[PDB]
Every structure is written in C-alpha cells, then in structure tokens.
Amino acid sequence: KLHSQANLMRLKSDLFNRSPMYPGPTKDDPLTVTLGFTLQDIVKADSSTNEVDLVYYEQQRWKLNSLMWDPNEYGNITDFRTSAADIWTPDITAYSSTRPVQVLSPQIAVVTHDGSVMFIPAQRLSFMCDPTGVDSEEGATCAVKFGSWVYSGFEIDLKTDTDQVDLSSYYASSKYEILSATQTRQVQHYSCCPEPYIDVNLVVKFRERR
Amino acid sequence: DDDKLHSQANLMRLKSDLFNRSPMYPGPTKDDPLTVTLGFTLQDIVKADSSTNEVDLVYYEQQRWKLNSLMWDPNEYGNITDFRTSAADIWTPDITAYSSTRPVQVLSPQIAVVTHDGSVMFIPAQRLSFMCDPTGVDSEEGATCAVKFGSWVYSGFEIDLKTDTDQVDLSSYYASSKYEILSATQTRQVQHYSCCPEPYIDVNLVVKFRERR
Amino acid sequence: LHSQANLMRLKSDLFNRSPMYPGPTKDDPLTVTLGFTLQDIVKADSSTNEVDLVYYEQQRWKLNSLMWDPNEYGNITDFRTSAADIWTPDITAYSSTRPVQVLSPQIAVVTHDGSVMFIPAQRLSFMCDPTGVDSEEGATCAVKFGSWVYSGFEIDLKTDTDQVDLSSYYASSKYEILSATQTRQVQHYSCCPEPYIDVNLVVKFRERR
Amino acid sequence: SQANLMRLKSDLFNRSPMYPGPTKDDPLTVTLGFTLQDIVKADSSTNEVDLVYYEQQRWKLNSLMWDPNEYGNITDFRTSAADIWTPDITAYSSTRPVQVLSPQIAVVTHDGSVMFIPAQRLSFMCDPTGVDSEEGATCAVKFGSWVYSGFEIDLKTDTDQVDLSSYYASSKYEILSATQTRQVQHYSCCPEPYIDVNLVVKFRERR
Amino acid sequence: DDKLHSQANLMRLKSDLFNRSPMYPGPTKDDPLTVTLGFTLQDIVKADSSTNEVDLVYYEQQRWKLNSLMWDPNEYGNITDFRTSAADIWTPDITAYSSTRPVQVLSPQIAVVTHDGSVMFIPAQRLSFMCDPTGVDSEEGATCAVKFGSWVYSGFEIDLKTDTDQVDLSSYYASSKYEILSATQTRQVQHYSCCPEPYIDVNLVVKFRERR
Numbered sequence A: 001k002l003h004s005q006a007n008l009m010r011l012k013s014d015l016f017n018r019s020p021m022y023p024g025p026t027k028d029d030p031l032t033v034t035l036g037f038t039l040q041d042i043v044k045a046d047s048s049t050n051e052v053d054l055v056y057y058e059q060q061r062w063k064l065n066s067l068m069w070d071p072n073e074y075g076n077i078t079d080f081r082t083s084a085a086d087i088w089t090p091d092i093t094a095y096s097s098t099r100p101v102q103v104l105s106p107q108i109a110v111v112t113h114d115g116s117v118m119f120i121p122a123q124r125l126s127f128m129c130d131p132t133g134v135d136s137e138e139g140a141t142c143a144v145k146f147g148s149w150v151y152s153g154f155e156i157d158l159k160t161d162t163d164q165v166d167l168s169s170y171y172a173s174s175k176y177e178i179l180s181a182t183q184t185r186q187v188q189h190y191s192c193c194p195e196p197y198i199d200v201n202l203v204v205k206f207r208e209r210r
Numbered sequence B: 001d002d003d004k005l006h007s008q009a010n011l012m013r014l015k016s017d018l019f020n021r022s023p024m025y026p027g028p029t030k031d032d033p034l035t036v037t038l039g040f041t042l043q044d045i046v047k048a049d050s051s052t053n054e055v056d057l058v059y060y061e062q063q064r065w066k067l068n069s070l071m072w073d074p075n076e077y078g079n080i081t082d083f084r085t086s087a088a089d090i091w092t093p094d095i096t097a098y099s100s101t102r103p104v105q106v107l108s109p110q111i112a113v114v115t116h117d118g119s120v121m122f123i124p125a126q127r128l129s130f131m132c133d134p135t136g137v138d139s140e141e142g143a144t145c146a147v148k149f150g151s152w153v154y155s156g157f158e159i160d161l162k163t164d165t166d167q168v169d170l171s172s173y174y175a176s177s178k179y180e181i182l183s184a185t186q187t188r189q190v191q192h193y194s195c196c197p198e199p200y201i202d203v204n205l206v207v208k209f210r211e212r213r
Numbered sequence C: 001l002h003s004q005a006n007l008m009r010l011k012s013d014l015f016n017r018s019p020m021y022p023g024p025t026k027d028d029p030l031t032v033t034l035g036f037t038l039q040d041i042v043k044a045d046s047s048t049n050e051v052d053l054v055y056y057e058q059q060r061w062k063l064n065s066l067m068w069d070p071n072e073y074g075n076i077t078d079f080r081t082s083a084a085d086i087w088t089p090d091i092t093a094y095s096s097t098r099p100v101q102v103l104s105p106q107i108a109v110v111t112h113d114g115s116v117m118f119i120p121a122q123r124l125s126f127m128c129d130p131t132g133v134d135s136e137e138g139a140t141c142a143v144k145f146g147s148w149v150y151s152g153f154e155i156d157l158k159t160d161t162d163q164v165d166l167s168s169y170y171a172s173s174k175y176e177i178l179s180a181t182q183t184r185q186v187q188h189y190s191c192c193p194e195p196y197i198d199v200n201l202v203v204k205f206r207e208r209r
Numbered sequence D: 001s002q003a004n005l006m007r008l009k010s011d012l013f014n015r016s017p018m019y020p021g022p023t024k025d026d027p028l029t030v031t032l033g034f035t036l037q038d039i040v041k042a043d044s045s046t047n048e049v050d051l052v053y054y055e056q057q058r059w060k061l062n063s064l065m066w067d068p069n070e071y072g073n074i075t076d077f078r079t080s081a082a083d084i085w086t087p088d089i090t091a092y093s094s095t096r097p098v099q100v101l102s103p104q105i106a107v108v109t110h111d112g113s114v115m116f117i118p119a120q121r122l123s124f125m126c127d128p129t130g131v132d133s134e135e136g137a138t139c140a141v142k143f144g145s146w147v148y149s150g151f152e153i154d155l156k157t158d159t160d161q162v163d164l165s166s167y168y169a170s171s172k173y174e175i176l177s178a179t180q181t182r183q184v185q186h187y188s189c190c191p192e193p194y195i196d197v198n199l200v201v202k203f204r205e206r207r
Numbered sequence E: 001d002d003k004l005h006s007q008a009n010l011m012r013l014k015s016d017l018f019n020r021s022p023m024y025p026g027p028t029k030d031d032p033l034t035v036t037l038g039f040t041l042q043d044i045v046k047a048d049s050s051t052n053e054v055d056l057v058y059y060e061q062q063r064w065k066l067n068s069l070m071w072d073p074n075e076y077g078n079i080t081d082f083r084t085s086a087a088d089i090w091t092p093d094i095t096a097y098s099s100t101r102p103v104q105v106l107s108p109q110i111a112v113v114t115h116d117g118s119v120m121f122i123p124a125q126r127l128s129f130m131c132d133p134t135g136v137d138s139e140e141g142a143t144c145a146v147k148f149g150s151w152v153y154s155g156f157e158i159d160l161k162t163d164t165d166q167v168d169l170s171s172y173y174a175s176s177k178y179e180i181l182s183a184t185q186t187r188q189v190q191h192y193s194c195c196p197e198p199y200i201d202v203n204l205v206v207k208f209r210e211r212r
C-alpha cells in the first residue's frame, strides 16, 4: 500500500513537475477533442425573457503524448485523478449563454496511461431559447452551439461519438419531458478566412409534462 | 506561560511535519482504497418550488476517513491528540450530489478535525437545491424526494463509501419549518454498469415531507 | 517618519519574526467574548420561514503573542490589521440558510495588551417562523452562534451582557423590536464529557405602525 | 519612457517599504465626494434603496512622492488598488455587500497624491414613503472609516453638494436634492472625535 | 519529433515573453496605445421598466498592439500566434460608464497574441445598464445608449478607436423578445473644462422594440 502510494506520487511528480506541460494545440499539432452531452433536467423555461435553464453533464475527452506512461515503470498504475486546474483543458463554451455557467461537480479529470484525459463537468446553463409551443403537443424547439472560443478547426478538431444526446439519466419528474435531443457537429466558414470553425449544435425538443 | 509556549510550538512543529516536510496524500488507488463514511443531519427544508421541481435543503454533511500519512504519536508532540486545519490544506473526498440544480452553498467554516490515529472529520453545513417534484406536499401522505451522493471520479474499489446508520439524524430539524419530516433515510447502494466489473457506490437520501399544520 | 517606521517594525516583529498563533488547545484555552448590535430586520419571508438580519457582531479575544511594550515602539498603543493576517475565531450561526454576507472591511484592531477587537457587519438569513408578526404580541425567533470545531475546553465563549445593543436599530425599519437577548448556553453531547458553548440570540419583533 | 515607468513603480513598490496606514502621530487626510448617477430601485416592502454612484477618494502620502526629473518627466501613473494602501471608507447602513462597477485602479501623481474613484452599486436602509408625491421621500446614509477615529483619518469634503451633473436623465426617480455633510461625533467612552459624511438624498417618482 | 519541437518552441516563446521579460506597465503620454473596440450584439435579454435597467448580451472585441509582444516566427519554429490567459497580460481598463451591476463574463478569459505584437481579446458579457424602455411596445421603439471607455486613461494615453460605426448584428438572436431597429457604436471626443487633454469614449446606441 505504501509502495502503490509512492508510485502514484512519483508518476504525478514526473508528469507535472519534472516535465514541461502542454501549452495547448497548434496548427502543426492539432488536438482532437470529443464532446458529448448527457441531459439531466430542463429546470426552467422563462417566456418573459426567452431563457431556458438546463442541467447536463458535458463529457470531454482528448489525448496527449505528454501524459503517456508505461504502467510497468509505476507499480502497474494504469490511471489517476488530477484537479482540472493542474492540466490543460479545452476552452469549450456555449455560444449563446445568457449567464455564467454554474459548475455542479468537483473539477477533477481522469488520466489514463495511454495519455487520454476524461473530464466531465456537471453544469447548469441559462441560454437563449423561445419556449413558445411548450404547452402544446408539438412542443418547443431550442438550440445552443458549443465550441472552442479561441481555436479554429485546424487547432482543435472537435468531434462527437454519436449525434444522440444521452437521455438515460433524464429526470423522470421534470416539469418538461424531452421529445428529442440531438448533438450535431457542424463546420462553419467565415468570409475573411480559409480555416474551418467547428461547433456542436445541441438541439432539444421539449414540452410541459402532462 | 512556559508550558503554553511549549504546547503552541509542538502544534506548529506537528503541522509543519505533516504538511511541509511530508509529501501529502495524492488520493486513493485500487491497491490502497479509502473508506469514507458519510452521514446526514437534516436541519431544514427551506423551500419547495413546484413551478421548477426544485427543493432546497439545509443539512450538515458528516464525512470521515482515515490516513496513515496523518498519524502521529502524541508523546512526540507534547501530548497533542488532535488539531484543526483548513479543508483546502488536506485532501478531501469528491463527494457530490448527483442531481443538484445549483452549486451547493457552504454555510460553515471549511475546517477539518485531524486526530492522532490519522482520522479526519469534515462536516460542511450546506444549502442544496436538487431535483424534486413536491406534488402531494399539501396532503397527509406528503411528497417523497430522493438525491444520491457519491464520488464523482472514484469507483467502489478506490473510495469505499459507507454509512454508520441508515437513519438521517433529525434531532436538530427546525421545529418551525414550513415542512415537517415524515421520514428521512440514507441508504448505501451498490451499482454495476454493464461496461465495467467494478462496483459503484452511492448514498441515497430519501426524504418524505409535507406542509406543517 | 519615526512613528511610521515604528509601526512597520512592530508589525514586522509580530507577523514576520514571530511564529503566529496556531489556534487554541485544551492546555491553552482561549476566551472569546461575543456581543451583537442589531441594526435592521430587513425581511421576513413566511413562504420559506427565513428572516434576514443586519447586525454588527462584536468579537474580542486576547493573545500573549500579540503583546508589546509601547515604550519599545515609539508609544504605539494599537494598530490595524487585515483579518486574514491573524487568527480569528470560527464563530458561526448554527441555523443560517444562506452564506453570511459581510458588509464591512475585514479589519481588526490590536491593542498593546494583546487584545484583538473584530467587528464584522453582516447580513444573515436564518430559520425563523414569522407567524404573529402582524399582531401586538409579535413573532419570536432564535439563532445560536458558536464555534464550529472547538469545544468549551478550547474556546470559552462568553458575553459581557445578555442585552442585545439596540441603540443603532434602524428607526424606520419595517419591523420594530420588542426585545432582543443574547444568552450564553452550555450543552453536552452523550458521546463526550466536554461542554459545548453557544450564544442564543432571541429576537421578538412585529410589523411597525 | 516605458523603462522609466517600470523603474519608478519598482522603486516605490518593491525597493521601498509601503504605507502601513495612519497613526495618531501621523494622521491622514482623506477627501471624499459623491457623484450620484442613478437611483435604480426603491423597495417599500423591505425599506431598501439601491443607488449607483461614483465615490471619489483622495489622499496624499510622502512615501509616494518622486521628482519627475529623475524618471524621464513622468508626473503620474496608474496602479491596481490592491497594490497600495486604501482607506477603509464604508457605508454604515448598507444591507448588502457593495458591488463594484469600475476597474479597481488608482491614479498616483508625483506630489504623492492618490485619486481612487470606484463606481459602486449600494443597497441601504431607506423608507421610500412619500416617493409617489410632490414632496418626495428623504433618505440618508453615513460613510466613514470602519476602524480609524478622527485623530487617525481626518475625513473631509470639498463641497457639501453632491455632484448631480451625470445623474441619469431617464431614471425612474428624479433628485430634488442631494447633500454630503461632514459630521463630527463624540462617544462618551472616548475623547477622540469620530467623523462621517452623511449623504442625504431627496427624491421622487418621475415626473 | 516535429510535434515535440513545435511544443518546445511555444513554451520557450511564452517563457521568453512572460517570465524573462517584464510586463507592459501600461501606456504613457510619451507612448500612447491605440485600442480598437467593436461590439457584436447577441441579445437584449430583459427590459425592466420598473427600474429602467436593460440587460444585453454582447461580444466586446478589443484589439491593441505592443512592441514587447513581437517576435520573429523564424526564431520560434514558425509559430505566428498563441493563446494566453487574459490575467497573464496587460489588458485595457475599458468600462461601461452607466452599468448598474457588475458585468458577468460568459466566455473563457483567453486572448490571442500574433507575432506582430497584436492582441485580440473578445469577452462575451452580460451587462445591466441604465435605460428607459418607454416606447418599446410601439412601432417607433425605445432608444438607449451606454458609453464605453477607459476608466483612468485620457485620449493622450489610450487612443480609443472603432473600425466601423455599425454594431455587428449578424449573430443577433432571431427569437429574442426584442428586435433591433438599429445599433451604432460612435467614437466621441470629450472635453472637460478642467483640462486640455481629450477624453474618448465609444457610445453604443441601440434602438429596439418588442417583437410582433
């Protein structure tokens, strides 16, 4: 037990203190970031301001060579945990939020020996959404885009594993029931510039539960 | 006066020895799992909002664990058997409500108690908004709501989450609350995910309550 | 320039050259004296049974490690320090419903006898049923204050008086105060022989006419 | 010019010991004035009123003096308010923490004078009864040091007229008058005077 | 091999600019700084006629250039730009002059630095400011204005400019409660009777009404 602890501390020291740390992606060395949503609750829909409040888990995954190790050199440790503040994390942002996002989970990432990092902040988000039709069978439809704030598609290649939002943990007694929820990778161009810009469009269709 | 300076010097030396001169706990591993014992003392149901299905609780969340790296012999430190430390200066478990709707608001100073056997006691008072349908709260049968607590990033092979009792402590519940408590339980649950052989642990806090009359 | 240099030297001597107070122990208990000056009952919410008070919380304690001879420091008898740079007691409301909001600069007064005076102005929401507030008899509410992590053998919590100071109470508040008391209470827990101390603030109030 | 500015700041902040605050032997004059921008809200259910104002604070320190000839003719600079001593001037009857609206930056001039002007939103205790009438409502709030007497911080004003020249013309509330009056008080315990500036605002619903 | 090399060069560059060099201490009269400012208005969220406050969501584009942030890409593996936390560089103290609550930041506080020493910083923000929404429920709509400028620097220290006087409405939320009739951003030069120096602000004027 002392041995496994000593190995973990040595590993973390080797990656965080003895090695220079990831400065972020470049055009020459682009980073793939995979993004997916698990929608937990539509808490509130405000038709006086056209803001809707969601609670979701935002799953982020990327992989770095600088975070790789051989478990045989570190007492068979295959993974560890680190504060999200102590590693580089992608600047993925909602583009149409109306209040700062509120974080609901401890800011801790999972690092595996292949260099892959898994970071899953639970969040409450207020975003721009007209809930007209929410009190009808057809329901309301709203959308919000997520993407890097400062990196193009040539620097952060943003991807999804599926276009289906995970609804398996959606709160069964929410005020709003979900008719559908999709997450679609979109490529966008700006007329100034040849590089592509990537976002993931979260489209949610919902109505008042009855 | 002389003894008093001595006891102070010993406390400072102890804290220095544990926090500055020793490497500090990096968290649990599969080879070295940590038992964390969890219990709730429910103080008040402040608010039940049927327009959003959120309920607000005030409770004390008792957390206890034990580390070898925090052990000392009181005889080597002027018979000091315990001390206090800021929660920011030690490792603490990442226990989280799984269905909160707003960041938890902390109501107490973030200070932990460390004893010479290496056991740590940390008891944040908290206000929590969580997902809850209060339908039936204005009836005799009352409303029932539930919220799970557990580690965000550690399985049952890394943090073994336990309770001392399945009864929520109601002995400090606010007697003039808007809501009276019919029952409150805290149940350790073990769960498996089909991807993975390891067990995942949570503590399910189930509260049954109604408007006071 | 002489008086400034002496103040800086004094603060350097107490804060930088000396090891600082690690907190009280069973062998070296600390007396903390507590008193309230109630300024306003801002709000009483009968839909949630929360009441909001604005008060000044007077805290006083004394440390040997903060003593000095004024003759060795140009006749300086007192100074000011940020509350973050000294130890302060962890006195807490036991039945608050929101984090306390601080209204005053977090500065303490240190006198040459080693006594420290710290008086945060605060807004507090706490658990309170305001039923009867719209009547002659009024509503009664209570909230306890005490250390979060220290027993009576470590922090001996005291009051100078059991009367809450109402001499600054806001004369055009929505609520008038019928009475306000602050009572030291001693409590035992069945696990443990040590006493636990709190100060119970009891306020009786009604809607003004 | 940039090298000289950096050298000056280094000389004042890093190479010199910094101002520990005023003493009885070395009292500090702090001059205070208000520019009232808006009465945002008047809440008669809680008797709280919300103001937006600029709070002008000025003082002078020998330890912040320099000769511009020794620093490439630099006569002034800017510094974060966190990197210098600032006075603990406080509203005595606020009901919520003050919200700061401007960057916390002070202006330091070569004579050692410091100018610090935080824009603030303040909720304070105020009965707005009469606000819906011609006579209007009257409210008051005192400002002063929290921990220094008049023998340590000598609090002054330049004028007793609140500056209303930037008052928001389409506010919900119009200002009938606004004054800022230095008051001296004695407490029976103590011989030292205690100073505050009483901000009295008379206002009514527009128009 | 190249990938390790490009990473090493980025780290060396950042170390050279942030650790081995002193920070820009801010502008002076002898060395004034041009700051270019522009707005992209995303939403009028709320108009409160009981307090005369309006809430906007916008992106505030800020650009300036510093010699101390220049480098030759040939000396750093052809790196032409990088990203940095806004806390690690000097940023201009541009402020709304008639806000009623602290601005709420909606984007990560990261700036873009290019090898010519130019810095681009674009905080997304929610702002409450003083605004009478009377006429918002009519065809002519309501008109409100808010000035932006340096809090502590004159026109001889920060020369505040715009690239256009048209607010960018191309991302305005199509299902907002309020539709925008017009939105302009006008550089103004102000003289104060105390002082010969000019004071510069950018006046954001928005005309809007309830969507029908």
Ligand SMILES: C=CC1=C[C@@H]2[C@@H]3O[C@]4(C[C@H]5CCC[C@@]6(CC[C@@]7(O[C@@H](CC[C@@]7(C)O)C/C(C)=C/CCC7=NC[C@H](C)[C@@H](C)C[C@@]72CC1)O6)O5)C[C@@H](C)[C@@H](O)[C@H]3O4
Pocket: A095, A147, A148, A149, A150, A151, A152, A190, A192, A193, A197, E039, E040, E059, E060, E061, E112, E120, E121, E122, E168, E171
């Ligand atoms: C819903 C609309 C949005 C609009 C913004 C968008 O961004 C800008 C300028 C941007 C467009 C794309 C090309 C360019 C040119 C250089 C560069 O500068 C930005 C970062 C990346 C970089 C260095 O390549 C600089 C930067 C920090 C951008 C932050 C804002 C955005 N970031 C993500 C992504 C990069 C944009 C596409 C979309 C955008 C957020 C959503 O990108 O500039 C500015 C704002 C005001 C809007 O009008 C648009 O136009």
Ligand SMILES: C=CC1=C[C@@H]2[C@@H]3O[C@]4(C[C@H]5CCC[C@@]6(CC[C@@]7(O[C@@H](CC[C@@]7(C)O)C/C(C)=C/CCC7=NC[C@H](C)[C@@H](C)C[C@@]72CC1)O6)O5)C[C@@H](C)[C@@H](O)[C@H]3O4
Pocket: A038, A057, A059, A110, A118, A119, A120, A166, A169, B098, B150, B151, B152, B153, B154, B155, B193, B195, B196, B200
């Ligand atoms: C109410 C539903 C909840 C669902 C989440 C749950 O967690 C995930 C993936 C997770 C399931 C269990 C197996 C696995 C595989 C590796 C690992 O990764 C997470 C940390 C622990 C580790 C290393 O063993 C990585 C991590 C940071 C998990 C955060 C989320 C959760 N954490 C606590 C606990 C670990 C889960 C059971 C429950 C869960 C919070 C409540 O766990 O992955 C993701 C989210 C989106 C949900 O769909 C589920 O599925």
Ligand SMILES: C=CC1=C[C@@H]2[C@@H]3O[C@]4(C[C@H]5CCC[C@@]6(CC[C@@]7(O[C@@H](CC[C@@]7(C)O)C/C(C)=C/CCC7=NC[C@H](C)[C@@H](C)C[C@@]72CC1)O6)O5)C[C@@H](C)[C@@H](O)[C@H]3O4
Pocket: B041, B060, B061, B062, B113, B121, B122, B123, B169, B172, C094, C146, C147, C148, C149, C150, C151, C189, C191, C192, C196
């Ligand atoms: C209105 C009811 C309240 C109940 C709490 C109370 O505290 C606990 C356990 C506590 C009772 C007294 C004996 C003991 C044993 C060791 C010790 O542990 C606490 C700190 C002091 C120490 C080391 O002596 C550990 C600690 C950090 C206590 C924080 C909580 C409280 N602190 C102040 C004071 C110390 C208690 C009396 C009262 C209490 C806040 C008010 O105290 O344990 C836990 C909570 C959940 C409640 O059920 C009770 O019981």
Ligand SMILES: C=CC1=C[C@@H]2[C@@H]3O[C@]4(C[C@H]5CCC[C@@]6(CC[C@@]7(O[C@@H](CC[C@@]7(C)O)C/C(C)=C/CCC7=NC[C@H](C)[C@@H](C)C[C@@]72CC1)O6)O5)C[C@@H](C)[C@@H](O)[C@H]3O4
Pocket: C037, C056, C058, C109, C117, C118, C119, C165, C168, D092, D144, D145, D146, D147, D148, D149, D187, D189, D190, D194
């Ligand atoms: C509207 C009523 C207010 C009442 C307070 C006032 O302050 C106290 C005690 C105070 C009265 C004046 C004399 C004395 C004696 C020593 C000293 O202690 C304070 C700081 C200055 C010092 C060292 O000279 C210690 C300190 C930190 C005081 C903070 C509170 C105030 N500060 C500013 C100014 C100093 C006071 C006049 C007014 C007061 C804020 C407004 O001042 O003590 C306590 C509180 C509870 C009230 O009842 C009164 O009485």
Ligand SMILES: C=CC1=C[C@@H]2[C@@H]3O[C@]4(C[C@H]5CCC[C@@]6(CC[C@@]7(O[C@@H](CC[C@@]7(C)O)C/C(C)=C/CCC7=NC[C@H](C)[C@@H](C)C[C@@]72CC1)O6)O5)C[C@@H](C)[C@@H](O)[C@H]3O4
Pocket: D035, D054, D056, D107, D115, D116, D117, D163, D166, E097, E149, E150, E151, E152, E153, E154, E192, E194, E195, E199
């Ligand atoms: C909508 C009205 C506003 C009014 C303010 C304005 O500023 C003051 C004094 C100011 C006017 C211009 C000349 C002068 C003289 C020296 C100097 O002092 C300020 C910083 C710049 C400096 C050193 O040149 C000192 C400082 C920190 C100013 C902060 C306030 C403002 N700053 C930006 C800009 C500098 C002003 C024009 C406008 C102003 C914010 C908007 O500027 O003083 C004070 C306040 C109370 C108002 O009455 C006016 O008058």
Ligand SMILES: [Cl-]
Pocket: A021, A022, A086, A087, A088
């Ligand atoms: Cl990293």
Ligand SMILES: [Cl-]
Pocket: B024, B025, B089, B090, B091
């Ligand atoms: Cl630890």
Ligand SMILES: [Cl-]
Pocket: C020, C021, C085, C086, C087
């Ligand atoms: Cl101390």
Ligand SMILES: [Cl-]
Pocket: E023, E024, E088, E089, E090
């Ligand atoms: Cl810089």
